[PDB]
Amino acid sequence: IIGGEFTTIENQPWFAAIYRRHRGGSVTYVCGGSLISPCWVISATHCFIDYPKKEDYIVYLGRSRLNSNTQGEMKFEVENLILHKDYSADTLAHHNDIALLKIRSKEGRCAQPSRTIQTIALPSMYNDPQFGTSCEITGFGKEQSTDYLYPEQLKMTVVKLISHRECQQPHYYGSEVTTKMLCAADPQWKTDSCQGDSGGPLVCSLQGRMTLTGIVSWGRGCALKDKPGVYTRVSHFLPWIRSHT
């Protein structure tokens, strides 16, 4: 997250931190995700498409820090790594960029709700906030485009939904943006998602319910004028989520 604020997991207790274990035995951060039921985390297919083996991954819930343990956290293996069969446009403007991870601890269990671990509601079908609505995004992604390191402490920021008409202007993203995507940005372009935030939640309040409106998916640069963040539009994927869960 460019700009924004630091936070802890109590302010986004559905947030899942997803890592991969390598050949060396070294473990590196991959992407965010959101807990949508005790055994399921939703994320983005592009985070896994090049390395689809479930055994390679570790998921934490209740975690506020990237490389240090948070009290109360829970650690899981990935029992099933479900990528969307219609994923495409890996080069940039990813289509169908949504993934499910069925989580299972060493003891064979799923998430146990606590002050730091909670599920987030899914939207009802085709039911998104109007453009101009302020929503929040959360992640461990870079704080500056030029940074080499990811922040050790979780971050959040506020972005506003942009109309599909605005986002599809040639000087924004043209036809790269589809009806199954949402754009969001800051009016000054000073805060945004960045590398390492993918898979994480765009949460908006509808009729008083915090709802997983989007999944961080793609964008050119970070916090650049006329280049919003682009998010998988969860409200267009409910049959796919339902049928894989």
Partner: peptide, 13 residues
């Protein structure tokens, strides 16, 4: 190979 911010955990780009 993958351009922009959505390219974590990629073999290339």
């Amino acid at each position: 190979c993958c351009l922009g911010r959505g390219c974590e955990n990629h073999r290339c780009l």
